[PDB]
Amino acid sequence: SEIKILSLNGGGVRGLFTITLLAELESIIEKREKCENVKIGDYFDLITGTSIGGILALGLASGKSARELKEAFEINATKIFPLKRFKNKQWWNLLRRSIYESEPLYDAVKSMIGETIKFEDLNRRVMITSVNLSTGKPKFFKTPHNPMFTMDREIRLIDAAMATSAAPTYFKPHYIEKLENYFADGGLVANNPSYIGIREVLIDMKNDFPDAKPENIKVLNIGTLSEDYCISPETLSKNSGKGYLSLWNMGERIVLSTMTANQHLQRFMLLREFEALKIEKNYVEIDETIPNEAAAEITLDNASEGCLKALRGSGKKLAAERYTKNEELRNFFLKKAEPFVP
Amino acid sequence: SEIKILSLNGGGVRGLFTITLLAELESIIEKREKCENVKIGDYFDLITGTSIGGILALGLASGKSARELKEAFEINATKIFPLKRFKNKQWWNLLRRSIYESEPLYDAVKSMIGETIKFEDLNRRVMITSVNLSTGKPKFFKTPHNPMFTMDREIRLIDAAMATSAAPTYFKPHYIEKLENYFADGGLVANNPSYIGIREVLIDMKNDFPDAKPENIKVLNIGTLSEDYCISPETLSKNSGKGYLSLWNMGERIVLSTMTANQHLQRFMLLREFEALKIEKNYVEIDETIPNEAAAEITLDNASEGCLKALRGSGKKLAAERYTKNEELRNFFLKKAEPFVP
Structure with missing residues (x-):
């Protein structure tokens, strides 16, 4: 059999790029393939995600079309990343509190999926990647698709969604009152969750797929136009010594370079594995650098009209051209996936 | 065959435990097997490492016995992490410059391995993990044991050792003049290089081992008594949502939590793979814990006499029991690994 994973990296409004590309793909299937009420989440056996990619993954798994999620994201993007806090980062504010607030993001997620939906009421398998800053171990909020691992069953989807999107500096750690633990962004370990998703399909989801091999797994890693992040050599040369706050810019650069490094490492591992089995064709990635953007101005948070317009245009053009x-x-959407019964 | 990998985690001072365990193992080998002039690095076909573990791996690959490295570390644990800078972190100091200086660490690494030795002069394969903050991609300083990857041939060992130990907020990023790039700690991507070490053996070390399988790989992953790191529940309950400077202690806690989470994730993946292939015995780990210290009290840069004594005693005791x-x-040190020739 064929197993399809939908990996969604995390980048903030670059998540809006991801959802715009997904919605454009949905419309393209609806038009060309002569379908009605098509959801982009019904064609995948597992929907992995991290940060806002994880929020979109939960939205798709909950049974909502990428177009509704794109509309909610468009409505709530400026609320999630207000310019009032974006322009007043400085350092005397970042020392007393984190950037932005969890409440606008919480309301955005509540609009996207809801508040009373739990992992036990989901018809599609989903991962949420996070770091549990109470035991020191990463926490993978997955659906009860493995009988040996059936926790998170009584955990709301919004709790995992806020856990994965809590960037260490850009937000505050998310408190899950059920477990009496706090959680951080999943990008601290896996900003590209394709590799861990493949591992899960291979060794965890074995009741659903007893005969699973790498050669029969297809991954659709929708990037966030932020793969080639780097620190510009100018601020490095001017701050590699003491550092006039430009190196490790109040932890933002620590977090961003960490997420970029793990994403690169996991992509490298996945590509090397697929080349080892000569199944390099099985990995499909949609991510291209913006021609007008240098690989240093990539920001996790930019709700300005120009950045949103660039993300929207890139998503639409990339979706159309790649289809x-x-x-x-195109092959990813020939057949629908079978819902899983816990 | 039997491929043996010696992976050493990164803990800063807590590498004193690693080097003490290796030196004690050398001593027991000499006492029991009645050998003369035993180098603990002569029994492994690959010596990966990260941070101080990477420095120790470079020392062992250069041909030094673990006792010479232990003496050098005995002097340079105090000479590298001065009590003055460890007691003077506060908030207005770490705001301007990175804690400690790279020159004491550079002098220490020079004292152990040297300054004029490059990766092409080594007789044993070695990978050192680091993050290149100029391209944003992880950089694995490795010997030219694969003809396809050689661009590390003309790089001094001291440059790699200083690059892998440049812990963010703990040391300034290391500048390599040959490559015109800046590097950071390898613990951001892989604090436990055992998994990537096995990946390297399978996919890269194929010229020497054309027939490589997970079954015939044995990993001796020596920890640093820092696996069970976590943020104190009191600190979170006080300023997790509040986000005061105690949470994310000027990047110290961000980097430490990232190292702990990366190590946990990589160890989890390795253990899951070995359980899948029923080769759990292959992975050998001598990472115990200190039974007289809080989990949240694990620090990467504490070189006080009490902590050094605790690490030394733990190393000696663990070596004795585990031998x-x-x-x-014992099976690790039976037959010496053959040196590799480029």
């Missing part, structure tokens, strides 16, 4: 040429992006 | 009972540890 036109990339045969595998 | 007495663990037969795999």
Whole structure:
């Protein structure tokens, strides 16, 4: 059999790029393939996600079309990342509190999915990647698709969604009152959750797929136009010594370089594995650098009209063009996936 | 065959435990097996490492016995992490410059391995993990044991050792003049290089081992008594949502939590793979815990006499017990690994 994973990296409004590309793909299937009420989340056996990619993954698994999620994201993007706090980062504010507030993000997630939906009422398998800053171990909020691992059953989807999106500096750690633990962003370990998703499909989801091999797994890793993040050599040369706050810019650069490094490492591991089995074709990634953007101005948070317009245009153009040429992006949506019964 | 990998985690001062355990193992080998001039690094076909573990791995790969490295570390644990800078962190100091200086660490690394030795002069394969903050991609300083990857041939060992130990907020990023790039700690990507070490052996070390499987790989992953790191529940309950400077202690806690989470995730993946292939015996770990210290009290840069004594005693005791009972540890030092020739 064929197993399809939908990996969604996390980048903030670059998540809006991700959801715009997904919605455009949905509309393309609706038009060309002659379908009605098509959801982009019904064609995948597992929907992995991290940070806002994880929020979108939970939205897709809960049974909502990518277009409704895109509308909610468009409505709530400026609320999640207000310019009032974006322009007043400085350092005398970052020392007393984190950037932004969890409440606008919480309300955005509540609008997207809801508040009373739990992992036990989901018809599709989903991962949420997070770091549990109370035991020191990462926490993977997955659906009860493995009988040996059936916790998170009584955990609301919004709790996991806020856990994965809590960037260490850009937000505050999310308190899950059920477990009496706090959680941080999943990008601290896996900003590209394709590799851990493949591992889960191979060794965890074995009741659903007893005969699972790497050669029969297809991953659709929708990037966030932030793969090639780096620190510009100018601020490095001017701050590699003591550092006039530009190196490790109140922890923002620590977090961003960490997430970029783990994403690169996991992508490297996945590509090397697929080349080892000569299944390099099985990995489909949609991510291209913006031609007008240098690889240093990539920000986790930018709700300005220009950045949102660039993300929207890139998503639409990339979706249309990749569906036109990339045969595998079309092949991903030939057949629907089978819902899982816990 | 039997491929043996010696992976050493990164803990800063807590590498004193690693080097003490290795030196004690050398001593027991000399006493029991009646050998003369034993180098603990002569029994492994690959010596990965990260941070101070990477420095120790470079020392062992350069041909030094673990006792010479232990003496050098005895002097340079105080000479590297001065009590003055460890007691003078506060908030207005770490705001301007990174704690400690790279020059004491550079002098220490020069004292152990040297300054004029490059990766092409080594007789044993070695990978050192680091994060390149100029391209944003992880950089694995490795010997030219694969003809396809050689660009580390003309790089001094001291440059790699200083790059892998440049813990963010703990040391300034290391500048390599040959590559015109800046590097950070390898614990951001892989604090436990055992998994990536096995990946390297399977996918890269194929010229020497064309027939490589997970079954014939044995990993001796020596920890640093810092696996069970976590944020104190009191600190979170006080200023997790509040986000005061205690939470994310000027990047110290961000980096430490990232190291702990990366180590946990990589160890979890390795253990899951070995359980899948029923080769759990292959992975040998001598990472115990200190039974007289809080989990949240694990620090990366505490070189006080009490902590050094605790690390030394733990290393000696663990070496004694694990040589007495663990037969795999004895199996490691049976036959010397053949040196590799480029």
